[PDB]
Amino acid sequence: EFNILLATDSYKVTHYKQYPPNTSKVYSYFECREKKKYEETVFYGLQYILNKYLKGKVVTKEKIQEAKDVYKEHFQDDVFNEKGWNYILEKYDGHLPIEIKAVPEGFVIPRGNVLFTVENTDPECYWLTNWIETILVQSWYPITVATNSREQKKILAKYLLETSGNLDGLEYKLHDFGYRGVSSQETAGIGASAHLVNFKGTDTVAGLALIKKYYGTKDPVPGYSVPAAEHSTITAWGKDHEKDAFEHIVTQFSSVPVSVVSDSYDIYNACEKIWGEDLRHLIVSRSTQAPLIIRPDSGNPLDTVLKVLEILGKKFPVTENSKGYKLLPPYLRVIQGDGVDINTLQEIVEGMKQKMWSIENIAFGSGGGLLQKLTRDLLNCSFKCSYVVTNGLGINVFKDPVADPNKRSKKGRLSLHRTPAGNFVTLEEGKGDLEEYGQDLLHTVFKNGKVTKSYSFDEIRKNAQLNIELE
Amino acid sequence: EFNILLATDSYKVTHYKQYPPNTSKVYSYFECREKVKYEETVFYGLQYILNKYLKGKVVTKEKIQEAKDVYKEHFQDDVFNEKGWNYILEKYDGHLPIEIKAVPEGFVIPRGNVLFTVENTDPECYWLTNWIETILVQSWYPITVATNSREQKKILAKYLLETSGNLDGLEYKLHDFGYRGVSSQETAGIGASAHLVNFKGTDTVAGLALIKKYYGTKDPVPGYSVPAAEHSTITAWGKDHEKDAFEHIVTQFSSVPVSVVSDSYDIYNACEKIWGEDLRHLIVSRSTQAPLIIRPDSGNPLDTVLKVLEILGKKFPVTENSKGYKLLPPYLRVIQGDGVDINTLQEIVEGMKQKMWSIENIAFGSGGGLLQKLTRDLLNCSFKCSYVVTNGLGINVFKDPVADPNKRSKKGRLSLHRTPAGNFVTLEEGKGDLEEYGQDLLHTVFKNGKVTKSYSFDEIRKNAQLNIEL
Ligand SMILES: O=C(NCc1ccc(S(=O)(=O)c2cccc(C(F)(F)F)c2)cc1)c1cnc2c(cnn2[C@@H]2O[C@H](COP(=O)(O)O)[C@@H](O)[C@H]2O)c1
Ligand SMILES: O=C(NCc1ccc(S(=O)(=O)c2cccc(C(F)(F)F)c2)cc1)c1cnc2c(cnn2[C@@H]2O[C@H](COP(=O)(O)O)[C@@H](O)[C@H]2O)c1
């Protein structure tokens, strides 16, 4: 079972002794700090953390004792604040006297803005605010996955629109392949749910249960997949029987979309000689609702996509669309699912456009590049204290290192507002109380053990929409 | 609750219809594929996965029904192998008819060797072997962290030994700061546990409980920490009261080691004026078992460290050790806990050596660099089918993409052996049975729902030791 008393950075155990005496309030905020591109971030993931780790009775007699025992050995000393945790147990039945205010989930906010704030609601628990910093800062992950996934949707939108005149099938152009490429089962579910804010194609099943449990959708499931082969299901037939493998598989899944990895021995021979000659008759007969999706899985991503397309282009009736780009027959498509990140995704669709191929032909699968190859410093996610009350007086606090202006933090009580031009502004020093900037966009989502405002996964998807999808 | 029927990549759900008819055996293996850095990998993490996810009754009527309903919507079709999973439930009480053989945890193994193998023990369950690829492949992570952590230890060991003549305090030179910088709670523990194979300093509490539950140590805890400050505990005193903050903190922890971040406003001012003049009397009076550890947290990592050392070197009695390198008084140390990855760690210790500062002076804290900035392709961790039986006939299978020789997989039944020079070799095509290379070094660690071999965290630590340590 999970223990909130053991879910923090070790040194935070010793912090209650280091704040100024007579400190009754510690007020902290979280932001994706601006750097001197990712100019806007999707806010997603907090509601999961709140429901799974912060709400309800999170303190017990056994959990306090368990932590006391651990820290005594961990520190070789009794620095653990048993008193403070026992106070919460007895006064509030184990509920955290904490208030958290957050921008609605799905919201797209420019860098350098307050996304959420945290503060204690009982003066005895001044220390509790930054106790849970560590657990709250982990929200950087689903935020970063949702943001990076969405930036990739922008690229796909731009090229699909230019080469086809519309955005049909956009939400199925970037599929989640990274279940095996993430660090854990929990990360897999969280990361998969963040990708599904923007797209509908996933193979990371874990994300489905997370969304159903913490967010919910009107639809039965938020994400989908279709039958496909792996190297083991092709190679098991032995080297000389790749054709038999292919034939058995496309026949097994004759009436649904099927993807078949074709690079086990020679991708270019498979497309030209097996798919384009030997088994061609099994391809041109397929429904538009059940195409064959050819999957290369090695070589330079751009070059392999181009060459495969040129091969299929010569073995199949290729048409040209209204925009002037080449289009494969409806029963035949390609998915590039190896070495795809936001950088290579751009290189590929750009290269395809150069060679007059429509982005309608291609879908992408992304594993590590989607769910693992991200860090907290990509969006500069940071949780800092901006305001404290000591001796009844509230002072605005902040850091401002001489050698790095970028690491400077915000002063005092904060609020997020719409500017007159429809953009976003974060007001500092409690200036939001002057009410010259309309209503705070930060809503109370957590207070005293209770989740006070929730959003469904449908609302989040609506909020995270692209402008081009709106227009 | 965890459901293994939902713990795989979607397309693997459709795979039982794709193998050649009358397949009775699927046999697969895991290696850190070959490619001048990361030539050897620490095998760590499988035992966690085995216990938490694979052992015992992992199949129930309820998990089967739940999986059935999810996949019907997820595929918009009925493709889920309800029959196969029901067979496992009824024939083995939910225990996986699987055998897994693996190298001992902690073992350091050169790239391109079989680390573990998996095969089904029941013909009916040919499809099971690669169902669990996804969960087993996630062992890449603890493997990679343990490896990258150990490679950094080799770097620290070289420079500590060179500048101080010994390896005292090596296992406390790289501290785990990665709790907030990882993707989840589970990942935090796994990653922190992996780091603790090589070092003893961690701030990721979650790693301790995991080790105790899945590995176990003779000692009460496998990792340690000391009190320290954060920007919030300094800045809360207000800009004009940084001196007061520092003084309160060092006095609160006057008999234990304490680290204080000094870069909130002006790192070089705090080292020269506050620590070096105003509060100097509270530092020189501290015990060797309770030093102040100054912590910069901004600027160029190498440049900041050098300037800080030169500032402290001029305000404090500096000595010269037996190797001729400068050394702070024993009550005063430094920790660099910002911007530390394996690359910058090397840049800092080497730059320090060039300025004649001992590595005794410094410790490193690493967050994202240690536990997050890693991927599966760093060691090329891969799981592939090498052997199948169809119609009673054994076939040595493999992939070999024309456009990438590096992705070529191994053929047939595998085994791991010592060479006559005492190095590792992986034998293919069942050639291990010829007995020309001695006995297979892999051990059956999992068979039919039961863990059959496991290793204490103490034995893993022993196995992962550096050569210079031995
Ligand atoms: O084909 C796969 N899954 C089925 C599949 C089939 C077709 C599509 S699609 O063409 O987008 C499509 C079409 C129609 C409808 C849908 C819809 F969605 F509507 F149903 C989706 C999408 C998924 C597949 C294929 N390969 C996969 C994985 C997961 N891991 N890997 C492998 O592991 C690596 C992980 O990547 P990395 O970490 O190295 O970067 C990848 O490269 C692969 O080798 C999944
Ligand atoms: O000071 C901290 N912890 C206490 C602490 C103090 C001193 C040491 S030590 O000097 O190694 C030492 C000395 C004696 C005994 C031990 C022993 F071990 F025996 F007890 C350890 C070891 C730990 C500390 C300080 N900062 C921390 C964290 C966790 N996260 N962060 C922040 O996270 C970022 C990580 O960077 P990034 O890579 O994610 O970008 C940093 O910038 C920090 O702001 C912990």
Swiss-Prot record, chain B:
InterPro entries: Aldolase_TIM, DUF5598, N/Namide_PRibTrfase, Nicotinamide_PRibTrfase, Nicotinate_pribotase-like_C. GO terms for molecular function: cytokine activity; identical protein binding; nicotinamide phosphoribosyltransferase activity. Inhibited by FK866. FK866 competes for the same binding site as nicotinamide, but due to its very low dissociation rate, it is essentially an irreversible inhibitor. It comes from the Eukaryota. Catalyzes the condensation of nicotinamide with 5-phosphoribosyl-1-pyrophosphate to yield nicotinamide mononucleotide, an intermediate in the biosynthesis of NAD. It is the rate limiting component in the mammalian NAD biosynthesis pathway. The secreted form behaves both as a cytokine with immunomodulating properties and an adipokine with anti-diabetic properties, it has no enzymatic activity, partly because of lack of activation by ATP, which has a low level in extracellular space and plasma. Plays a role in the modulation of circadian clock function. Its EC number is 2.4.2.12. Expressed in large amounts in bone marrow, liver tissue, and muscle. Also present in heart, placenta, lung, and kidney tissues. GO terms for biological process: cell-cell signaling; circadian regulation of gene expression; inflammatory response; NAD biosynthetic process; positive regulation of canonical NF-kappaB signal transduction; positive regulation of cell population proliferation; positive regulation of ERK1 and ERK2 cascade; positive regulation of gene expression. The modification Phosphoserine is found at residue 456. Keywords: Acetylation, Biological rhythms, Cytokine, Cytoplasm, Glycosyltransferase, Nucleus, Phosphoprotein, Pyridine nucleotide biosynthesis, Secreted, Transferase. The modification Phosphotyrosine is found at residue 172. It comes from Homo sapiens. This is Nicotinamide phosphoribosyltransferase. Belongs to the NAPRTase family. One of its GO terms (cellular component) is nuclear speck. It is found in: Nucleus; Cytoplasm; Secreted. PANTHER family: NICOTINAMIDE PHOSPHORIBOSYLTRANSFERASE. Pfam families: NAMPT_N, NAPRTase. The keyword Phosphoprotein applies. Pathway: Cofactor biosynthesis; NAD(+) biosynthesis; nicotinamide D-ribonucleotide from 5-phospho-alpha-D-ribose 1-diphosphate and nicotinamide: step 1/1. Transmembrane segments: none annotated.
